[PDB]
C-alpha cells in the first residue's frame, strides 16, 4: 500500500492472513465487506489482487467477482474515452478500466496515479468495484 511523504510498501503477510481468515471462517457473511475495507487502507490495485488471489478455493465466487470487475472496468471505459498523447512532463497517461483493475498497468503506474497532484485514486476506484462484487455474492445467499 501507499503510506504517508507518500511512499510505497509491499502488502503485509499479516494483512493477507487476516483476509484469508475472514474469507475462510465467515464466508458469505456481510462482515467480509467491512473487513475488506479495514484491511485495504491505501492499497494499490496490485495489493487488492494479491489479497483476492491468496484465497484458495471459492473459484465460482471469484468468477462472479471477476465478472463484476469486468463490467465496472467496461463502464469506466464507456465514461472515460482515451485521449491521444504525448504525455507532458510530470504527468500520467489516462488509466483504462484494465489499468484500474491492475491487469494492464505496472506497479509504478499505479503508484504514479495514486500519488500524483492531483491524484487518480485507482486503488479506491477498484475497491468500489470489488465491494460491489462482494455484495452480489452475499446478496444471493
Amino acid at each position: 500500500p501507499i503510506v504517508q511523504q507518500m511512499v510505497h510498501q509491499a502488502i503485509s503477510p499479516r494483512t493477507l492472513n487476516a483476509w484469508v481468515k475472514v474469507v475462510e471462517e465467515k464466508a458469505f457473511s456481510p462482515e467480509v465487506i467491512p473487513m475488506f475495507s479495514a484491511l485495504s487502507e491505501g492499497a494499490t490495485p496490485q495489493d487488492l489482487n494479491t489479497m483476492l488471489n491468496t484465497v484458495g478455493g471459492h473459484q465460482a465466487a471469484m468468477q462472479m467477482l471477476k465478472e463484476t470487475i469486468n463490467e465496472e472496468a467496461a463502464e469506466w471505459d464507456r465514461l472515460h474515452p482515451v485521449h491521444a498523447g504525448p504525455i507532458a512532463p510530470g504527468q500520467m497517461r489516462e488509466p483504462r478500466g484494465s489499468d484500474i483493475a491492475g491487469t494492464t498497468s505496472t506497479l509504478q503506474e499505479q503508484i504514479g496515479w495514486m500519488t500524483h497532484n492531483p491524484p487518480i485514486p485507482v486503488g479506491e476506484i477498484y475497491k468500489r468495484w470489488i465491494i460491489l462484487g462482494l455484495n452480489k455474492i452475499v446478496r444471493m445467499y
Partner: protein, 169 residues
Amino acid sequence: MELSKETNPVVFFDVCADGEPLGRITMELFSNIVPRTAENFRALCTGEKGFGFKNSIFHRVIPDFVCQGGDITKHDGTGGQSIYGDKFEDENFDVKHTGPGLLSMANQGQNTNNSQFVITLKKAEHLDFKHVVFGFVKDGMDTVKKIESFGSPKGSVCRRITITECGQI
C-alpha cells in the same frame, strides 16, 4: 536546421482564435527522413483525399510543451484519421525532439498514428522513441506562441483555435 531540403514539401496553416486572425504557420516536412508520415500530413493539408485539416482545431495546448491539433473526426483528442487508415505504424524515430517548432505525431501508443499532431514549444526528449518527428516550423513561430498563450497546464484552451485555411505552397 541541417535536415532541411529545397525539395521537401512545404505546407501552411492559417490560424484564427474565435475569428481573430493569428497569422500563418509555414512548415517543411521531412520527406527525406520520413516520407510516409510526411505524405500523410501533406495530403491532409491539401485535402486532396476528400478530408483534411481544414476547419480542424487545436483542442489541447500545454504551454512550454505542445500545441496539439489534427483530430479531424472528433475534434477533442479521441479521434483522427490518416490517408492510410485510422492507424498506421511508427515509421522511424530518427529525428529527435531537440527544441521548439518541431512537428511530431500524436498517438495512443505503438503504431497508432493518424492525423493528430503536435507543434513543440520546447525540447522534449521524453517523447523520443515514442513519437515520430516529421517536420519543423519554417516561419510563423510567432503564431505558434499566440496559440500557446491560450493554453493551460492540463491542456484546456480558453479560445476556439481553428485552422481556417491550409494547403501546400
